[PDB]
Design a protein around this ligand. Sequence first.
Ligand SMILES: [Zn+2]
Ligand SMILES: [Zn+2]
Lengths: 121, 121
Amino acid sequence: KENKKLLCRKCKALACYTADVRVIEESHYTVLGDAFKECFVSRPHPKPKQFSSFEKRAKIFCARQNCSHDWGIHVKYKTFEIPVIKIESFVVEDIATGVQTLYSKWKDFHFEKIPFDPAEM
Amino acid sequence: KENKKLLCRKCKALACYTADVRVIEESHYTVLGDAFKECFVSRPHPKPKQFSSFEKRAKIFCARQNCSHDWGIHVKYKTFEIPVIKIESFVVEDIATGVQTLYSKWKDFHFEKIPFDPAEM
RNA sequence: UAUAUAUAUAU
RNA sequence: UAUAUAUAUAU
Ligand SMILES: [Zn+2]
Ligand SMILES: [Zn+2]
């Protein structure tokens, strides 16, 4: 459907665009592009676990100064070291109207969800 | 809508019927009749509190022999003494089919909601 | 991602 | 009844 903006729920900075979001194993969400990389910062995870093919390695936060909002975690998937975000950490903004939407769960967010793909990478 | 049975989620005993349920201030639920009063027991509330029109005085549980499953509270609303239940403690069973539903919030339970009325009482 | 327990705040 | 924080279980 419509491409939208994901903003940091705390400082409202543009984190990324739904178009760059990919779905892993139908329930986890990752973001593509070197752009989102300059948008978050990591920190070793207090209790790194391994469920299915992920290995919870660190935690991620908004890179902005006085913000540092918790955005989820960073993991090791297939051969990939990628981030995994929670929508509860951003504000979705319709680019046309400016209307903002607060989701707590990725299930309620009905955008065109695109499967993750190694090939892209 | 359909008149249904309310069973104790724990021991599955019959607590009441939706016909006898009355909604208060549009978000609080009580049950009418003496019959239901015989289905539960109460204990003076540990943390009694007063809120817009109620005065939380006690906690009510399933009176059934070896269950005593927490069912909600018992309050002083206006000049009355009525029990306030949470659907979370019950199993809604459809009488005609026997089908059962587990609600966590009354907002999701869609039956015919008769507003509490002093004239009845 | 989800399940469960626990206090704390509001009417 | 609604919100917020906190630990444990699961993949
Ligand atoms: Zn931020
Ligand atoms: Zn019971």
